[PDB]
Design a protein around this nucleic acid. Structure first.
Ligand SMILES: [Zn+2]
Ligand SMILES: [Zn+2]
Ligand SMILES: [Zn+2]
Length: 92
DNA sequence: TTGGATGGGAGACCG
DNA sequence: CGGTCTCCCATCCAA
């Protein structure tokens, strides 16, 4: 219930989830608390789990299978699967 | 045009 | 109340 409020008071932004507030604060601070560390791919995520879905790309865990016979295309994320599904089927 | 890939965000799961 | 996870968009990104 205790939404954590954005340091820059006037902004009036508030979120109980720390990750959310980090992602918010990143806009002002430029901070990215969840780095990937990996050489070259030294990415800076502002929230946990977004890092984990990114990790699907390192692990190669392509799995979000379009539920369409024959067109059983496997995508990296549910949203990518949805975009495809929309783009190719749910065009309406 | 397309699916791979990232910042941002409501909601689900767990405690 | 709050981290990890579930689920997703919009956008960026390389093909
Ligand atoms: Zn703010
Ligand atoms: Zn990485
Ligand atoms: Zn399809």
């Amino acid at each position: 219930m205790k939404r954590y409020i954005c340091s820059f008071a006037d902004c009036g932004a508030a979120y109980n989830k720390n990750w959310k507030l980090q992602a918010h604060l990143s806009k002002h601070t430029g901070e990215k608390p969840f780095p990937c560390k990996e050489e070259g791919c030294e990415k800076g995520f502002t929230s946990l789990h977004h890092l984990t879905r990114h990790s699907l790309t390192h692990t190669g865990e392509k799995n979000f299978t379009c539920d369409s016979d024959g067109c059983d295309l496997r995508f990296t994320t549910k949203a990518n699967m949805k975009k495809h599904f929309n783009r190719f089927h749910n065009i309406k």
